[PDB]
Amino acid sequence: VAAFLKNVWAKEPVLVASFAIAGLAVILPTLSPYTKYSLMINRATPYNYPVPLRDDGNMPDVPSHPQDPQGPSLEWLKRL
Amino acid sequence: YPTKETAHWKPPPWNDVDPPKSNLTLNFGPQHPAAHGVLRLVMELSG
Amino acid sequence: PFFDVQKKLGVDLDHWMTIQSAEQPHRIPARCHAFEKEWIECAHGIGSIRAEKECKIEFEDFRECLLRQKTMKRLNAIKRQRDKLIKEGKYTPPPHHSGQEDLRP
Amino acid sequence: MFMINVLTLIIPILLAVAFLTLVERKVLGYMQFRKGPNVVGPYGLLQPIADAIKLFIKEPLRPATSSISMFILAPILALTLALTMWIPLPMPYPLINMNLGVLFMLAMSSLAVYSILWSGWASNSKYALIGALRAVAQTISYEVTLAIILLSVLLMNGSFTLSTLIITQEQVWLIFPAWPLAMMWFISTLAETNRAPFDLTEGESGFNVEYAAGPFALFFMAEYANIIMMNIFTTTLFLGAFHNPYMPELYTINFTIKSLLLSITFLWIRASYPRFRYDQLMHLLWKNFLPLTLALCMWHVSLPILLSSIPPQT
Amino acid sequence: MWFEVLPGIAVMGVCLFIPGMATARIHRFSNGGREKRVAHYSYQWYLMERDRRVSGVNRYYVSKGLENID
Amino acid sequence: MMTYIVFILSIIFVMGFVGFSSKPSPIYGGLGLIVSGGVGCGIVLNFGGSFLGLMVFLIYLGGMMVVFGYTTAMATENKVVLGTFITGLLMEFLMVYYVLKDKEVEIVFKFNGMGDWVIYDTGDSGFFSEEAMGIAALYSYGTWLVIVTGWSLLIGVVVIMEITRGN
Amino acid sequence: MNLMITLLTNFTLATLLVTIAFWLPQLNVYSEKTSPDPMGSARLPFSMKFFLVAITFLLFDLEIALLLPLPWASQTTNLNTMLTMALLLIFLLAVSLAYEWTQKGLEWTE
Amino acid sequence: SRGEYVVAKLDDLINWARRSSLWPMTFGLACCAVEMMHMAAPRYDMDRFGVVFRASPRQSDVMIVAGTLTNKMAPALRKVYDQMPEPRYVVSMGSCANGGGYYHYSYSVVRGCDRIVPVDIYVPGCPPTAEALLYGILQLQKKIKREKRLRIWYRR
Amino acid sequence: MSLVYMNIMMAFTVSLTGLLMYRSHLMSSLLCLEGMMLSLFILATLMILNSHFTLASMMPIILLVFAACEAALGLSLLVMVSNTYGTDYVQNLNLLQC
């Protein structure tokens, strides 16, 4: 497992670097803890208007103002 | 039913293979510096 | 044959690019989103034979949203009568259609 | 007022290309333990002027051409494409500020192979046509790695905007996270412009040996109008300078110095090595640059996702 | 010696300095002493045409602030 | 005259096809198709399809017509041509005279004769090109499309290496 | 609009310089030349390998064309699917390169 | 008059540009090519006069016939001369190019390249020194300097 | 409808009639075929951009890619004909009449 690897690193180091970088690019997003935050930032980016809801009477988790404490927050992004 | 127009039509070959019905020859004469002076070269190349 | 593998296996291979009323990136509406939605909700489930005759008005509204043949025909009629009255001299353009009024917002 | 901006773009391009010949001959002279031109002007400064006037008053061939019209269209397309590559270049502000300037420059540089192909058509010499086909296959080979390296870097840019690429490198040069891309990019731009060790138009007779001094001075200068541009493009792409919006000439002096050093680096490469054999640079592209470029393209796809560093879309 | 190559390099550097400084001064001249508005996106174009309307002199760059409202 | 510029390009586009479908040679046929690709690309760019216009330049002209001119160079070393050219040109200019004197025409479909600046939309799209985000949707919504296209291109490589071998 | 002005100016300047180059020494009456090449008159033989590298360029350029919207595709909310399809496309480009490798298609222009 | 002064300044301009941008073809025949290389070498350095070597006769201005012209080569030399765009110049370098030299009475040697091409500067020596070839090139430059093409054109 | 659509369809029909009955170079037939593809690209692009139907913006690229791959395939057939007769004259393709 190290004789063939040293042999291909002595003969074809271009392809060894190629397969190694490709293998890292495949497997490493499944091991990184920051891959969750990529998804989280790309859904926190407001391309559209936050269309308001008609207050039916019972929506406690919806704020009545942007500065209200309920709703989604981005303190995880301001800290990181 | 061979007509007057469809009369020269010979049958196709038995293996369905027809016959296929050459290499380049260059002349690098005395117009060139990376041959060291005065040389003519008749190359026969195959690609 | 239409072997409906996508519904039998419950997978969405190409239903998403099929109509303009489907889920678009960033909630972008098509220009005739409402007309196509109305015609699709009219013609749903009733079969194509009943749809060709019972959803004619929604389909004409949607085809005329797509091609705008009636709108361009009306604009042709208005612009042609306007050109005739300009050539005859019985009409003058207002300052808000000649470009002399410094627009609103 | 915009026409003044177009002229102050394109006339100094031709002047810089003219004096690049002097810089090439002088820098190649001193690296070869000799001098370049110093007789014709003071310190050789009138050598490109005398050379351009000398070429413009030589007799052209006007040979038996397979196409007269493509014999005319090859210098016109060469100069027109060589001048239109400069119009989205942000230095620090571009002539044409477009949202897709990178893809624009990629497409217009892909259009430059028709000059080589039509110049090989217009000469009746079949060996000049062979050399033109080898030059075209060289250029379309290295356009592949240009496209993929450029895509991998624009995955860190966020857009196809060339002016965004200044905002991208406000903290660090983009040669630090992308130096393998930068070195394959630099050698690939060297191979785009038929520049040594990748030139195959001086020895085994090139595609433009039919042209003599009327169109040739134009072809050549269009060719050097690409070279500076590519280095300027490399300067925008991997060596992004500081931009103060209240003093834009800080960026203009900084990128100008870096682009001069990179064009001199082209001159210093061609004076240091022998040429490739033709299949050796085909071996260099298809077997050495292309697997690494695909691997690093996978790495620059997955890397901003795994570091939570996806750049902004706008 | 090696400093003989520097006049040609300096001339070529001035020729490369002219287009950038030129387009900077022209964009400051044609836009009211400021940068040219970048409109890559339709929201930027909408704000720029709204500036051209609210200026009253058919120029996007003529800015109107609190003095324009009562 | 500037309001009809898309229309003007379209006329050149038609002319460009009659430029090369008359076929004096594959050389000049390729030249006419390259000029036609440029002007139809200008048509595409004038509706806001900037990425699709640069796909015409990068891939059609810069990628594929290069290979057509390359194969025309390497493999392929009047009256009918000029007659078909002037015939198609007379047909197209009589169509232009009809649709400009009438502002309405019917060859197969009914066509308005005003400019196509009227048929646009008056809205905005915020901080993105809608066409750019729709092409970006190839990786998020277009999974099966990417699969079949990549398999077709891999099979295309394999198929070219099969039939060019001759063994 | 200003872009078309720039393109037209570059085409105009190129056509001006090319016409001056083709016709300023045609004012001269130098001499009339009769002048009665490595190959003499042999027909250009087809090179199969040049065509193969041109088609390999065309197919990899199409795979590049599929790869081109990736900086915009990195902005999606479906990043797992997007990353999977991006790695699949670059892998299929690598597999087309590996088949072009191992079937000796990259030889004598390697 | 005035137009005489105009064509005099134009002759000075075009003669300046032609003599200060001479491009010889890198084309040697015999031992004189070694010394012609020594004139390209760093000590003498023809490139500082605006004198560069170019491979093709199409982008070349002067043919330095540097070496023995044999009978077997003279049509190739004439073809090289006929591919050069005008104004083209010829510098005969060395005794064999000038008049046959050491091989004058040979069955196979053209006795002087001026039987084949018109010659502008004859450079003597066997070989002439590289300094002597550079002297001949500067004498060629001075010969180009006193050309009167537009004055004779204005007087014809 | 739109007036530019008539010109794009007329271009398509011109290149379609150029493909069909000429009996000329094979490369000229492939050029007419790719002119047909070019007009399909332009027409699909103008429709999809006109209707603001965002998900079909990736459709013409697909229409490009496949068909350009198709074009590559055609050239290889031509090259095999160019390796058989020395020309791409389609009247050499008459072995299979009998």
Ligand SMILES: CCCCCCCCCCCCCCCCCC(=O)OC[C@H](COP(=O)([O-])OCC[N+](C)(C)C)OC(=O)CCCCCCCCCCCCCCCCC
């Ligand atoms: C943009 C600014 C400038 C950029 C730098 C360039 C300036 C310097 C230029 C010098 C002169 C160059 C002239 C042209 C030379 C062309 C020839 C040449 O070099 O061929 C390239 C050669 C080709 O190989 P070769 O020709 O030497 O060998 C023959 C080939 N084999 C062996 C197959 C028989 O090398 C490459 O292709 C390398 C390209 C860059 C590689 C980048 C590697 C990144 C490293 C990643 C990590 C690796 C560690 C292990 C894994 C770790 C994981 C965490």
Ligand SMILES: CCCCCCCCCCCCCCCCCC(=O)OC[C@H](COP(=O)(O)OCCN)OC(=O)CCCCCCCCCCCCCCCCC
């Ligand atoms: C799973 C990860 C992702 C994989 C997919 C993505 C790959 C990215 C790079 C794309 C490369 C495309 C072309 C690859 C062709 C491979 C086959 C090959 O080249 O075999 C021939 C070669 C012998 O060379 P030869 O035939 O003579 O060619 C002329 C040069 N002398 O023989 C060789 O060179 C032997 C090659 C095999 C051994 C390489 C081992 C590298 C190990 C690196 C560390 C581990 C990486 C993790 C993944 C495992 C990879 C095996």
Ligand SMILES: CCCCCCCCCCCCCCCCCC(=O)OC[C@H](COP(=O)(O)OCCN)OC(=O)CCCCCCCCCCCCCCCCC
């Ligand atoms: C043998 C024939 C002659 C050969 C020599 C001459 C031709 C070759 C050299 C010239 C090449 C011309 C290329 C012109 C188009 C380039 C692509 C392009 O326009 O991209 C830039 C830009 C896209 O970016 P974006 O920011 O989205 O646009 C502004 C929107 N905010 O888009 C814009 O800014 C859009 C601006 C309006 C539309 C511009 C249309 C230009 C004219 C059409 C092409 C004309 C040339 C035709 C021939 C091409 C080559 C064959």
Ligand SMILES: CCCCCCCCCCCCCCCCCC(=O)OC[C@H](COP(=O)(O)OCCN)OC(=O)CCCCCCCCCCCCCCCCC
């Ligand atoms: C962005 C920056 C771009 C910069 C580009 C330019 C770089 C180089 C600048 C010029 C450098 C110095 C040039 C000096 C040339 C030689 C001057 C001279 O003395 O020539 C002598 C010659 C004959 O003199 P004569 O009177 O006969 O002598 C007998 C004396 N008893 O007399 C003559 O030949 C007549 C006089 C000729 C003078 C020519 C001067 C150079 C012209 C170059 C054109 C461009 C100038 C700059 C343009 C941009 C700035 C405005």
Ligand SMILES: CCCCCCCCCCCCCCCCCC(=O)OC[C@H](COP(=O)(O)OCCN)OC(=O)CCCCCCCCCCCCCCCCC
């Ligand atoms: C009504 C009156 C006007 C009529 C129309 C004429 C307009 C002006 C035309 C240009 C100037 C004409 C005079 C040309 C030079 C005449 C004097 C001369 O020959 O001086 C010789 C001297 C070099 O002497 P030399 O013998 O070479 O030295 C050996 C070293 N020991 O030479 C020198 O020292 C330098 C000579 C420089 C020549 C001028 C500079 C080049 C031309 C610039 C303008 C044209 C090109 C513009 C730019 C084109 C693009 C780059």
Ligand SMILES: C=C(C)[C@H]1Cc2c(ccc3c2O[C@@H]2COc4cc(OC)c(OC)cc4[C@@H]2C3=O)O1
């Ligand atoms: C390029 C530069 C600066 C030098 C090198 C050079 C010349 C001019 C001419 C030639 C040349 O080199 C080539 C190769 O080497 C020899 C060696 C020769 O003899 C040893 C020989 O004799 C005729 C001829 C040649 C060529 C020739 O014509 O200037």
Ligand SMILES: C=C(C)[C@H]1Cc2c(ccc3c2O[C@@H]2COc4cc(OC)c(OC)cc4[C@@H]2C3=O)O1
């Ligand atoms: C654009 C302007 C102002 C002039 C100057 C000029 C041309 C046209 C062509 C050339 C040129 O300058 C130099 C001259 O000398 C060498 C010598 C070379 O090698 C000795 C060499 O090798 C690639 C290249 C060259 C340039 C070359 O071809 O027009």
Ligand code: SF4
């Ligand atoms: S003149 Fe003399 S030294 Fe010169 S090449 Fe002839 S034999 Fe040799």
